[PDB]
Design a protein around this ligand. Structure first.
Ligand SMILES: COc1nc2c(cc1-c1c(C)noc1C)ncc1[nH]c(=O)n(-c3ccccc3OC(F)(F)F)c12
Length: 127
């Protein structure tokens, strides 16, 4: 019982939108990171039960992962690119806060973040 509900990926009361920046975030940015060799620990919510991390959700109150982001993009959950970018940043930050510098998972997150920033640097202008 000790995992919280995952972050919502749909909401009938949240306005939905399709922009070329959000299309780019799904088709280029997420795609790039999703299939990367270090992606797998970030492809779903942290299962603190299975991973035996009892203190995870005592420390991390704003969980986020790429599985959630991918679904949010696919479901047109975001109104703009900044909402999505914020979620990626939350994911990386959680990893850096909970784990110690130099830990393998931190190195993995840093590699993904470097790639993320490279791709966001080339975010296209709005149509
Ligand atoms: C260590 O952080 C995470 N590990 C996850 C994991 C999530 C994390 C994680 C993240 C991301 N941010 O904080 C933590 C903790 N999800 C699944 C999974 N399966 C698995 O065997 N592992 C795993 C377990 C122990 C040591 C390393 C592990 O993965 C790693 F090599 F990639 F680092 C994980």
């Amino acid at each position: 019982s000790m995992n919280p509900p995952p972050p919502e990926t749909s909401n009938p009361n949240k306005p939905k939108r399709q922009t070329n920046q959000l299309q780019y975030l799904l088709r280029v940015v997420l795609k790039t990171l999703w299939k990367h060799q270090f992606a797998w620990p970030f492809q779903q919510p942290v299962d603190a039960v299975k991973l035996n991390l009892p203190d995870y959700y005592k420390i991390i109150k704003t969980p986020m992962d790429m599985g959630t982001i991918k679904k949010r993009l696919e479901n047109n959950y975001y109104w703009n690119a900044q909402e999505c970018i914020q979620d990626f940043n939350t994911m990386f930050t959680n990893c850096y806060i909970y784990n110690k510098p130099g830990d393998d998972i931190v190195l993995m997150a840093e590699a993904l973040e470097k790639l993320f920033l490279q791709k966001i640097n080339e975010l296209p202008t709005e149509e």
